């Protein structure tokens, strides 16, 4: 076994591809995604953890012997030639190292490589916040030959290429992992055309958390002010208090409504809500201050009106709100 | 500096219950075990247990048989000795362990000591 | 003694040594025992779904190529000979980040024995992923796991056994967590099938039970005492409209005020927390408190009934609402 | 299609070759052409004043100890081989932090040509310094800068030049920043003179436009109703001291809630922003606002002349200053 | 003088030097003197339960291999050359994370002695994990430690002393926390038994007195002066509804806004802090205010009376409440 | 050329300092501030990017040939003796290796060895936060050999000893760069005597951004106290309501005051500013209350007082307190 090993590493290049002018190296990938990591919406990036394989033919490791499979350490991965396979949209990688190199490398006498290797991958994932928090997204994972053009590394799924686990035990706390694609294609860039293989995952948000937190309360508030219309038009002190209050009671509720998206200049349907239910309670305080003008100085009827139009203004509202934004 | 008292053992032929109170900077001395020794022997390890968060270890000869509990506001370890047996004729004694003093079996890593109870079965 | 003979004895089992080859290559798998010194863990963390443990990990095997005779003596060699030495391809399955700490130098032992028996430790720092059901919380038990498995060789190469049964993992009961205390640790061996082969698997789990004193005095208290702060505005008179007023909405200012900083030190999660629940629960009660002050006030320009009604009913409510919750999530 | 063959022609390239020493030493300076081909720009940071850039750094130049014949192909070799080879001492003079991806390899690339000419590209993640005048923020505008450098050779040995004239850095057109809009990007080549000697430069700088669409409306829009909100008490009765005196204190609390929540997100900078201005310019209404009231009540116990006084001059006062507060910083 | 006679020197006790082998193998222990120069403790954080510590690292021991004739000097070489000598397999139990700065250069320190006496200083920065006991905080008293033990080496190989008694450890008293005093500092040798055998340990403590003036600014003024506040109330009349319901509630108001900020800079321990304590008995009396507005304004619909009772119970039984808080934690 | 390198790196012992045994080795350091970055003033740490160069004669690398200077690589450097230069206050310092190890070594036919390196600190400063934030505070930079003693390696200032920039793209955007002064002295430690070489940055805090957020707010609000004096006895809710809700604003403004001091826990004057205009506020509001007691039941007259003696002691304090910072 061991005049085997030293054979083939003897007279053996690894600074040149198998097939060097001979044709393409065909390379066979395929991705076990032990798990996907939280999705940063401020960075824009999200983690997943995988079993990176991959598969190709170097006639220079052919050995004839009884055993035909030669599971190697992971010193040997740095003897022979390995692709040089890199992810475009990744911000930051690592391979774990604990307790050793999470690198396996078998290689049969039929002269198949197999080179399967633990990664960690903080991939790019560029998020269209409109309609927040009922966006849906999907997050690519895009990897190819950093040096190697079509016309030398083609890359190809096998026929099991993005397989995933349980699904329950992935750390997506706020999306709902719904659907996987993966594509095949060329990008020309300056050094020349490269095979690009894309996989796509789609992630819908759960929007549980969010109108627990402000829909139910900003409504709420939005329904103090009109309490202040029942009150009668003598009592100032209670209705400038109650108008006021429930101002600075949304504006308490509109800072923590936008703390975790980023600094995206486009109205979310989240700020637009925030934003329309600041006007309705701004509106009925003014409300008051025009019917307590006049009546110290119809219009006398404004409260009456008040019940009626500002509970059917927020009541159409959310109407158009809620349809334009869970249907469309 | 921690002071160590033991009481409860008694002259029986039965169950129990050993109380071991503590004083001073118990915090620099998280974990209690319990020793007995023979006469003619050296010390034995019966039991040792963290003042702080409640997970127990016990010697296989006690195993399933004597129970340690404590309590941070009483500042009290009480040991629980049931189905007595002749072999349980020794000396107890209460110590204090500190926090990276080692492994729990040695009494050698124990720095505050109790008197010691004489009980015989 | 002789430092010479037992360097020429060290040489001669490096010489011609492959570490590329396990122990009985092509022979039956080679048995690896593992136990585990726990140091400490550091961090749980909700929001990112793990814990950091810091451990002596260690790691009992036979290797016959590295037997050695006319030496009775457990050579503890230096750190740096284990390059030169075959290690099992052990691994974290869910870890996410581990690192072997290095200070002054690697935290390695390499220790050998006469028959081949080769004592492998290292003191590493891990942070591994552990889903949380956070339904239940604050009232939730955590059970976070930490896999170990072999990476390349199958069960035909090797295969993982707890040394010491039971016993293999020590140092629990030193562990002190702020938040949790360790109800239970387990230790399971079993095999996984993947598309490769099979693999050994052994599988430490800590079961954590989350410490409620500090969200019962931090978040429960403050809730409570306001709503029924809120119920003072029945006994208030009805014709005092600024006095009622005022004390309805400053009550919902300082509910909203609590809400807003007790939901940040968590991770978005879709589903109600015990904690959300009481929280939105209790902010309902105050808004139909200024409600009920609005009835009351249009009715009066009964009323009296209105507000006895109110005061029977309110407390009732809330006691009724709180009994069903402490019940549902204890 | 002979492996044996190219391998030979590789060692033949690589023995005797020094790495120490610069094409054509002692002689004319080296020519490296430059291009940059743009991932994206993962971040722009106020408090650090600085920025993450993501490219495809590649480096032109020609070596003609590595001119090989006979082979008429584009030599890609693996990225190990970059460590035989030289390459430009090419670093970046106002990063803070950088590194190149490692996974699964190095994102080295090196293409060798027939006629020595060498091909070396990397894809690199930087931290840029950028130095920000924020005097007019939100509505400032940036210009950020890459400079290119050499480190130890001066332009007698080495000489930098954009490969491609303005097309050398491409890939502008994707970068999609959230907050700040590319306007424009230049190309600078250029000699900076040190103590040690003259060494190439060339810059590649970002002018950025902060976008003003998310600060309209969640900082100046609630300032300006809070403003609005506090003229009301102008209309309601003076009488009404309870009603109006609330009014005003409450006013004062949300702009100040306003207040603590905006200049959170910003460094301390002792000039005054154009946020900072408008901010404490509303502020000194709503003050002004109680302070007319107590005039009011102290003349009162005319005092219908100061009201209506204050309600034509605090809007037009408040549009004044909004109107020369827009121009100076639009 | 002669730098090759130096030279051949060095060469020659490098020559057949094994690193692997310790001094006196298969002898009497070799003793390792070890004397501390603590540059600075960068920080304490409660959170994490650990400190930062940098220091210059030194060890003393004799090894008879290294020992050479005729140089009259000591041989201060490059760092470089302790991977060809023998260093202890010293390591620090209670760290978390290390490092050894390596700017310019590794800042190691190798020096020689005719004897063979050998001189190993590292300026090490350390993060040590430190228990806090937080329930007399924050006038508590904390001892941090610092162990130090041989990984591999046993007592029987290797032993451990302070080099110069209580004098090994220096710079404490340039130690200048922002938040803690160094009260005192101690110096323990003892030997740990494990199950592997028993090893030598060395162990430095601190004990850290917090400062108390900036919380008794920042977080008991307050809340004593928003108590005091509230009982203004009592003076108020009766039948001021609005007025004494206003106070009430945003008094209440208040102590939840001082409650929410002060609980953040604080682990979750369920233990009641002395902080803890103080916070939740004023945000009750402010609660029992208001309920004792409630209860006049419902009599008064003897008024006078309850008033007066309120008024001498309340000032009394809030310094009953800070007596006994304050003799309780101090 | 290569002869040249071949011969001098042969027979040479690194390990060994030029004139071991002869004489100290006389090393002159000079430094170019490339750029001083942001002060920690929670860390007590600020960052420095400078060009760190040292010159020493080394005679075992004198060559004799047309080339009067021999500018090599960064690998060269490991092959010579370094001088091993720390910097004593530094927590964390880096050397950059984008794209290249950035380190020059030029050797010249007379033995002169230049060696300079590109290096990123974070050097410690302890601050001093009293008289916060007009504070001034010197940050030291001290760097000497930590092995070899003041007999064996002597260091000492060129001619340009520290070089600064244009100071404008600098990162210090709170202090502002005031002062320099480099230092020689000798340090006695237990390993021996080391000359140690300090250069002490002068910053003075810029006040503009503190002034604005704490100082105007604060005095508004204790203004805005005594509007409660001219507001008449009878209107119990109002006076009530202006005194509790401008404490309850001083209670915001109080946090934010300290939102980037470390917790130190002697009185920084911003603290003293804010706590006393916290007292007035408070006394405004007992003042109404002892007001409405006896009048409801001279002290007649409080509102008379308080009118003249609330405005006069806070313009005192103010004297007092901006006189006693701004100067002393
Ligand atoms: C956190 O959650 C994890 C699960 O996610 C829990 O881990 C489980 O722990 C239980 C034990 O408490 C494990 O159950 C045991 O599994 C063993 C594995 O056997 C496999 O392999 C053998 C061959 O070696 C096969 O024959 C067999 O079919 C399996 O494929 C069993 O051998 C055990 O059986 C033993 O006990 C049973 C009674 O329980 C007896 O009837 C048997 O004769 C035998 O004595 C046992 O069934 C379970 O496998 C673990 N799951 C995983 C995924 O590892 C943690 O315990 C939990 N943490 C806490 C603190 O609760
Ligand atoms: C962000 O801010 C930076 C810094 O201010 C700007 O960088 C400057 O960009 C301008 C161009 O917009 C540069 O001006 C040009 O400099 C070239 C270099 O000249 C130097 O070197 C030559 C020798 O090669 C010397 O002779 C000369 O004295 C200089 O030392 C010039 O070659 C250019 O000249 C060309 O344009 C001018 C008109 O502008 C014509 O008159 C000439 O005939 C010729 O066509 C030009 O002068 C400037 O040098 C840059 N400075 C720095 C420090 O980089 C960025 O542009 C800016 N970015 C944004 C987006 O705003
Ligand atoms: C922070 O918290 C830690 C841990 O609680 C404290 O550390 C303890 O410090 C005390 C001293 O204050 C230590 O007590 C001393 O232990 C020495 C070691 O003895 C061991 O080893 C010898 C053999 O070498 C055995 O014979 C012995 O049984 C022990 O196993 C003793 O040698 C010392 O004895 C000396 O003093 C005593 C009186 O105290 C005399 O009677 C003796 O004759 C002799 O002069 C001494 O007893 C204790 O071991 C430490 N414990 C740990 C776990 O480290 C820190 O002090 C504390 N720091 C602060 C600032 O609070
Ligand atoms: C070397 O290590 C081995 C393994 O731990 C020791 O063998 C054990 O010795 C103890 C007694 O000291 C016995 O109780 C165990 O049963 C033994 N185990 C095995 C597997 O044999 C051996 O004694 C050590 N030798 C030395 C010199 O320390
Ligand atoms: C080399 O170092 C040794 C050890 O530090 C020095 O020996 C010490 O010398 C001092 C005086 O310089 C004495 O006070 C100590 O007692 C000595 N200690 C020992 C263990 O001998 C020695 O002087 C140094 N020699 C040189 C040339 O520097
Ligand atoms: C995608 O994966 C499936 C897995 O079965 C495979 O059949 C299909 O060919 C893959 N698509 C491409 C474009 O390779
Ligand atoms: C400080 O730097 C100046 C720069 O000109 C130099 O002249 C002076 O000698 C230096 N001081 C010392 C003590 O070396």
Redesign the interface.
């Known amino acids: 076994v061991t005049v085997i090993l030293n054979n083939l590493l003897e007279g053996y290049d690894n600074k040149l591809r198998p097939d060097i002018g001979v044709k393409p190296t065909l390379i066979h990938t395929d991705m076990y995604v032990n798990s996907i990591g939280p999705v940063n919406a401020i960075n824009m990036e999200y983690t997943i953890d995988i079993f990176f394989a991959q598969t190709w033919y170097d006639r220079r490791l052919k050995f004839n012997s009884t055993i035909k499979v030669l599971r190697l350490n992971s010193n040997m991965v740095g003897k022979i030639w390995i692709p040089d396979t890199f992810f475009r949209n990744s911000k930051k990688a690592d391979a774990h190292w604990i307790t050793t190199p999470n690198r396996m490398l078998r290689i049969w006498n039929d002269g198949r490589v197999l080179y399967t290797l633990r990664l960690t991958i903080d991939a790019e994932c560029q998020l269209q916040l409109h309609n927040f928090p009922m966006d849906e997204h999907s997050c690519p994972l895009e990897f190819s030959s950093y040096g190697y053009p079509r016309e030398e590394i083609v890359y190809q799924w096998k026929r099991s290429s993005v397989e995933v686990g349980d699904t329950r035990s992935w750390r997506l706390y706020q999306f709902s992992f719904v659907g996987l694609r993966n594509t095949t294609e060329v990008v020309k860039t300056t050094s020349g055309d490269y095979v690009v293989m894309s996989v796509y995952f789609d992630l819908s948000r759960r929007m549980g958390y969010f109108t627990i937190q402000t829909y139910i309360p900003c409504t709420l508030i939005v329904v103090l002010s009109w309490v202040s219309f029942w009150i009668n038009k003598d009592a100032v002190p209670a209705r400038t208090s109650l108008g006021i209050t429930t101002v600075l009671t949304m504006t308490t509720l509109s800072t923590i409504a936008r703390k975790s998206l980023p600094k995206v200049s486009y109205v979310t349907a989240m700020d637009l809500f925030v934003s329309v239910c600041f006007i309705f309670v701004f509106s009925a305080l003014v409300e008051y201050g025009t019917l307590h003008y006049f009546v110290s100085n119809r219009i006398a009827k404004m409260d009456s009106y008040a019940r009626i139009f500002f509970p059917t203004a927020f009541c159409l509202f959310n109407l158009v709100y809620w349809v334009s934004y869970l249907y469309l | 500096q921690v002071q160590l008292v033991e009481s409860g053992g008694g002259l029986v032929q039965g169950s129990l219950r050993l109380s071991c109170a503590a004083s001073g900077?118990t915090?620099?001395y998280?974990?209690m075990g319990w020793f007995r020794q023979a006469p003619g022997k050296e010390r034995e390890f019966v039991g040792?247990?963290?003042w702080?968060?409640?997970?127990?270890?016990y010697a296989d000869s006690v195993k399933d048989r004597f129970t340690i509990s404590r309590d941070n506001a009483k500042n009290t370890v009480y040991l629980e000795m049931n189905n007595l047996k002749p072999e349980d004729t020794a000396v107890y004694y209460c110590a204090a362990k500190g926090?990276?003093?080692?492994?729990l079996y040695?009494p050698?890593?124990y720095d505050y000591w109790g008197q010691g109870t004489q009980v015989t079965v | 003694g002789n430092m010479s003979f037992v360097k020429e004895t060290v040489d001669k089992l490096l010489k011609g040594y492959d570490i590329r080859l396990r122990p009985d290559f092509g022979g039956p798998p080679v048995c690896v025992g593992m136990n585990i010194d726990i140091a400490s863990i550091d961090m749980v963390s909700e929001v990112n779904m793990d814990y950091t443990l810091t451990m002596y990990f260690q790691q009992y095997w036979r290797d016959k190529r590295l037997a050695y005779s006319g030496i009775p003596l457990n050579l503890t060699l230096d750190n740096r000979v284990a390059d030169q030495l075959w290690v099992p391809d052990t691994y974290f399955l869910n870890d996410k980040k581990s690192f072997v700490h290095g200070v002054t130098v690697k935290n390695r032992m390499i220790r050998l024995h006469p028959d081949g028996t080769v004592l492998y430790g290292l003191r590493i720092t891990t942070t591994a992923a552990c889903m949380m059901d956070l339904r239940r919380y604050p009232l939730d038990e955590q059970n976070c796991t930490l896999e170990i498995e072999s990476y390349g060789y199958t069960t035909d190469d090797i295969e993982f056994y707890w040394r010491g049964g039971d016993k293999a993992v020590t140092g629990v009961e030193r562990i002190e967590l702020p938040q949790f205390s360790i109800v239970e640790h387990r230790l399971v061996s079993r095999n996984v099938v993947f598309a490769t082969g099979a693999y050994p698997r052994l599988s430490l789990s800590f079961r954590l039970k989350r410490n409620i004193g500090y969200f019962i005095l931090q978040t429960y208290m403050p809730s409570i005492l306001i709503t029924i702060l809120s119920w003072v505005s029945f006994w208030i008179n009805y014709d005092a409209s600024a006095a009622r007023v005022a004390l309805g909405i400053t009550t919902v200012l300082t509910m909203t005020t609590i809400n807003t900083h007790l939901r940040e030190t968590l991770p978005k999660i879709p589903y109600v927390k015990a904690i959300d629940m009481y929280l939105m629960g209790c902010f309902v009660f105050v808004f139909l408190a200024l409600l009920e002050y609005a009835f009351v006030n249009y009715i009066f320009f009964d009323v009296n009934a209105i507000d006895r009604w109110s005061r029977i009913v309110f407390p009732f409510t809330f006691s009724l609402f709180n009994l069903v919750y402490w019940l549902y999530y204890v």
């Open positions: 900077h915090f620099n998280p974990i040792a247990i963290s702080s968060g409640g997970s127990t270890s926090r990276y003093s080692g492994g040695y050698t890593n």
